[PDB]
Amino acid sequence: ERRVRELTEATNDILWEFTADLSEVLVINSAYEDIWGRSVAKLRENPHDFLNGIHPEDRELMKDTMQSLMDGESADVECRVNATEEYQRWVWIQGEPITNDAGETVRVAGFARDIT
């Protein structure tokens, strides 16, 4: 059923990864620009910039998401994005923690898919 879904519309997921303190973007692809309505260049210079593209109500859900990741759990959230389009896009985000030698979450990584 997944393949047939993919025939109907080619997948174009955002692939992302940040350091856990959001000091840097480690992975971001060009799909980010159309969906978020913001530049990858700006994100690299300020890794917190993606938050400005998230509806202000879903911004606090993101705090809960980061906390889950820091507790070593995977997370799965849906939120409204793209400030230029009055946040009319919905995105499905799934993230996982990448840990250091001591089991601490030091990077967070996943995908984001435009689900309308």
Resolution in angstrom units: 2.0
Long-range contacts of 18-26, Cβ-Cβ distance < 8 Å, separation of 24 or more: 18/47, 18/107, 18/108, 18/109, 19/47, 19/106, 19/107, 20/69, 20/70, 20/97, 20/104, 20/105, 20/106, 20/107, 20/108, 22/47, 22/48, 23/47, 26/107, 26/109
Q: Which residues contact 74 (CB under 8 A, 6 or more apart)?
A: 68, 94, 95, 96, 97
**C-alpha distances out from residue 77 to 7, 53, 60, 81, 88, Å:** 25, 15, 12, 12, 16
CA atoms within 13 A on the CB side of 61: 13
Domains annotated on the chain, with CATH: 1-116 (3.30.450.20)
Instruction: Name the experimental technique.
Output: X-ray
Beta pairing class for 89-99 and 75-81:
antiparallel
| Residue type at position 4 | V
The beta-strand segments (E) located in 1-116 are 14-19, 25-28, 75-81, 89-99, 105-114
